[PDB]
Enzyme design. Sequence first.
Site, short mmCIF file in Angstrom:
data_model
loop_
_atom_site.label_atom_id
_atom_site.label_comp_id
_atom_site.label_asym_id
_atom_site.label_seq_id
_atom_site.Cartn_x
_atom_site.Cartn_y
_atom_site.Cartn_z
CB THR A 191 -0.59 0.13 1.42
OG1 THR A 191 -2.16 -1.23 1.01
CG2 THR A 191 -1.94 1.67 1.59
CG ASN B 223 3.11 -1.98 3.98
OD1 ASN B 223 3.37 -0.80 3.15
ND2 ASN B 223 2.68 -3.23 3.16
CG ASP C 286 -5.90 -4.19 1.69
OD1 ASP C 286 -5.05 -4.79 0.76
OD2 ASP C 286 -5.63 -4.11 3.02
CG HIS D 211 -5.28 -8.57 3.67
ND1 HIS D 211 -3.99 -9.18 3.08
CD2 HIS D 211 -5.82 -7.13 3.44
CE1 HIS D 211 -2.71 -7.92 3.20
NE2 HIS D 211 -3.78 -7.21 2.37
CG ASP E 277 -3.18 0.47 -3.16
OD1 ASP E 277 -4.38 -0.11 -3.88
OD2 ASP E 277 -3.33 0.77 -1.79
CG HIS E 278 -2.01 -3.07 -3.72
ND1 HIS E 278 -2.96 -3.78 -3.08
CD2 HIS E 278 -1.58 -2.47 -2.57
CE1 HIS E 278 -2.88 -4.15 -2.08
NE2 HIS E 278 -2.54 -2.66 -1.90
CG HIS F 192 -1.56 -6.59 -1.10
ND1 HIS F 192 -0.82 -5.34 -1.27
CD2 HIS F 192 -1.86 -6.76 -0.23
CE1 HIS F 192 -1.16 -4.88 0.17
NE2 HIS F 192 -2.04 -5.79 0.76
CG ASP G 71 23.09 -0.37 -12.82
OD1 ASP G 71 24.25 1.56 -12.38
OD2 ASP G 71 22.19 0.12 -12.48
CG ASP H 173 27.91 1.89 -13.53
OD1 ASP H 173 26.93 2.13 -13.30
OD2 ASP H 173 28.36 0.38 -14.15
CA CA Z 1 -3.26 -1.94 -0.11
CA CA Z 2 25.21 3.57 -12.82
CL CL Z 3 7.20 -4.78 3.30
ZN ZN Z 4 -2.89 -5.47 2.03
#
Ligand code: CA
Ligand code: CA
Ligand code: CL
Ligand code: ZN
Length: 805
Positions: A159, A180, A261, A265, A308-309, A420, A683, A691
């Site tokens: 989130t 999170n 959400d 869950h 958000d997801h 998620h 990189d 680079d």
């Molecule tokens: Ca969320």
């Molecule tokens: Ca780089």
């Molecule tokens: Cl996390």
């Molecule tokens: Zn959640």
Amino acid sequence: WTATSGSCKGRCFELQEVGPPDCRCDNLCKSYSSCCHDFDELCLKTARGWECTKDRCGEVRNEENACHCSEDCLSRGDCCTNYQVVCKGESHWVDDDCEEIKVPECPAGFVRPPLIIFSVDGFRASYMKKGSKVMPNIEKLRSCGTHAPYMRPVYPTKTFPNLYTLATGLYPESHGIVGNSMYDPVFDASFHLRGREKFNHRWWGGQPLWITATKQGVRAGTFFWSVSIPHERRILTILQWLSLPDNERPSVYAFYSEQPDFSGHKYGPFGPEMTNPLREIDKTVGQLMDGLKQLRLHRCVNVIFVGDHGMEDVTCDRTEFLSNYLTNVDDITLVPGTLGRIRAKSINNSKYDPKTIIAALTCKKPDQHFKPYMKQHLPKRLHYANNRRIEDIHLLVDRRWHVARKPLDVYKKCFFQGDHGFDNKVNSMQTVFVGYGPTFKYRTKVPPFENIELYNVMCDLLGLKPAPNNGTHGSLNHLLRTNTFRPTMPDEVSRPNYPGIMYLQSEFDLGCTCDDKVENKLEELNKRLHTKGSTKERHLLYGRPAVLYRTSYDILYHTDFESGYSEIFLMPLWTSYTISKQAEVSSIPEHLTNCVRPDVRVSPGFSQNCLAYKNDKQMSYGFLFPPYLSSSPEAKYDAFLVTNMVPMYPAFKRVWAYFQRVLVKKYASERNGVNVISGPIFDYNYDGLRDTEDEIKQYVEGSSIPVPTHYYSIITSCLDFTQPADKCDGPLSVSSFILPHRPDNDESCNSSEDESKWVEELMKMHTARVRDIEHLTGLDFYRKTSRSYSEILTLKTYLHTYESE
Ligand SMILES: [Ca+2]
Ligand SMILES: [Ca+2]
Ligand SMILES: [Cl-]
Ligand SMILES: [Zn+2]
Ligand SMILES: *[C@@H]1O[C@H](CO)[C@@H](O[C@@H]2O[C@H](CO)[C@@H](O[C@@H]3O[C@H](CO[C@H]4O[C@H](CO)[C@@H](O)[C@H](O[C@H]5O[C@H](CO)[C@@H](O)[C@H](O)[C@@H]5O[C@H]5O[C@H](CO)[C@@H](O)[C@H](O)[C@@H]5O)[C@@H]4O)[C@@H](O)[C@H](O[C@H]4O[C@H](CO)[C@@H](O)[C@H](O)[C@@H]4O[C@H]4O[C@H](CO)[C@@H](O)[C@H](O)[C@@H]4O)[C@@H]3O)[C@H](O)[C@H]2NC(C)=O)[C@H](O)[C@H]1NC(C)=O
Ligand SMILES: Cc1cc(OCc2ccncn2)c(C(C)(C)C)cc1Cl
Ligand code: NA
Ligand code: NA
């Protein structure tokens, strides 16, 4: 300390935060334990609920009520959202036909259409189709406005990383909210969902939209909503702010819902219990739209409905335990769940070793449901490495699974049925986007895009200049009726040299040999033309890439391919070639197996040498234009030029050889010809950016030949595959990858098998956007097409995901 004995009288949901220990009345005071004594009483009224009824119509104003049905309510800006419907015979917004909003239709004094971001937590992309019967307001927004089939979140698909990406346009690695839960070793501080530390400003980097707006003279409503403030009150508060006087009224607003959400869950993404939360969210949208209609703002405000997801099915029994792999389980700290992050429990323990932790987690069980990575080896498309809060050791967890340290962590913490956080390419993690209003297009579907792009668009919607971010500004212009951003192509910084034949064979002492002394005016003028660029229009279909940094490089032409050869890095920056549907694959002839040929256009001093590869027992070499795809036995000699050679671990050559021998021809067959641009990427500091030479950590032993960390290919064809790649009249189609250049194939658990069983799977995992490669190389592709620049920007952000429908 807060002196909570001041009053919220006249101050309810004040827009400016007052400094402690004065008591606060803003929508954040609840979170700080700082609200004035009378906040609930004055600011969180609930009497009589949220809807007008027939018997309340034209009532006498009672200031105790949650909302009002009295005659004076419109001018006070505090009617219930259904007031006009119940009391004035009006229709609900959802029952009105939709009508194109060609121009903003705003009340006098509005300088610009306001923007309302309506964000929903856990709103999986397929809910739009699957819940459509129970979401009539959302469905109207969606069908009447501009929508995408889905919007790709950022990794990890949690989130706060995603909402803060929406607010800033930045990858989590750059904005700092990388999960999170977090530990920052410089601060020596931890960030958790619960608690106060998450409110400290030092966690939150970049510049979020409300700050961008404020700095440029645009006022903003608050984005964070304390959990105990009910949804109806959030909506009424937005509507009230919207009735403020012109000089006080914000132009940008956010609503947030914890649903679906929260229920997802508990019940899984499609649990029968999920229907009710979707109905309830839709009702909230209805309240906002009815409320805007009452204020005559429903054809003035731009509304963004955004998630958000998504949400996947995940249960307690689908948990892998590190205690089944590691003996030292108590010497590690794991951040667990739908991703893993591992660090040492104690920085005093010098017997801690990441190398042996990784090996102990690599391909140890036949169905293993996570894969360990050093963060720099994670697929580059995740952009998940360049931050000290991201632990060196990372576990990519399979969709539908959890990782935990020990079994006790799971039953002393089945509760949940959804979660998620997984890889942001996973279908179940995809979320939603709808834009509705005067500035968005009417009844328009747009392709899926990444949420990192929205900040730029929200800035355009508000006439703001965006802070520097990871969006590609202009790539979402096709969402907009007006306010588009007209970007120019970046200026080329380095112009190439075009060397002719300048060196005799005998000037080279590179330790290379080739069996090529086998000796015509017909075909000598022919070879000259190929070296001067006669086939260049065939192999370089979109113009040469522009070099956007200061450097020294040569363009080299050949019958079958063109390259931009770096005198600094001693290898091409890019190699371009076209393989038609009809092209034939051939083998490397026996007499040419170890052939490497001096390039008489390029000085010995700016060439690689074969002795270095001989001496370097770990390092071998490969070729950028594949000898297998030569157009003729004679053109094949060009492919063995020292200027087409690049350093490759033997383990990587297995990958590369299968890509070049089998896969390129397969793609040309399926796509009706492809144009391929390949090259190296450096990189070493895993920042996603090219680079400089002084950042290179590894060279071919005894030489100045730098070792790439990755190899890219960009593979382009006609979107209308009835047209051949080299004669395409309209839009293009692209897929790209950035393969890690690794000395082992430990990442692929089936690598002992034939390349046909694991190579293409690896390439799919390392799929990339052209834009990712631009960052990593300082090159700018597609400079000469017949397409509009905004369309090309959209193509450069495309990610081929290889998920099903
Ligand atoms: Ca969320
Ligand atoms: Ca780089
Ligand atoms: Cl996390
Ligand atoms: Zn959640
Ligand atoms: C995605 O988009 C973003 C935004 O455009 C891109 O990120 C930018 O990339 C730039 C290059 O890496 C980088 O520019 C550097 O800025 C330094 C000053 O930075 C501060 O100020 C800015 C502006 O307000 C601020 O945003 C920064 O915020 C970061 O740091 C704070 C905490 O410190 C965090 O809260 C915040 O989240 C953010 O962290 C992220 O960025 C830093 C790097 O800045 C990372 O370390 C973190 O992991 C995290 O990802 C800063 O507060 C400036 O000092 C740099 O200049 C040095 O290098 C130049 C090269 O030109 C050199 O000429 C100078 O001399 C100087 O070198 C000196 O310092 C060196 C290092 O200490 C030392 O070795 C030398 O010897 C010298 O003494 C540099 O210009 C810019 O800051 C970030 N911006 C953001 C917001 O992240 C990103 O690249 C894009 N991603 C992709 C894939 O395209
Ligand atoms: C639309 C939106 C909402 C947001 O916060 C809403 C929220 C989340 C969790 N708890 C309470 N309120 C944010 C934050 C960065 C998280 C401030 C950004 C955005 Cl773009
Ligand atoms: Na070697
Ligand atoms: Na392997």
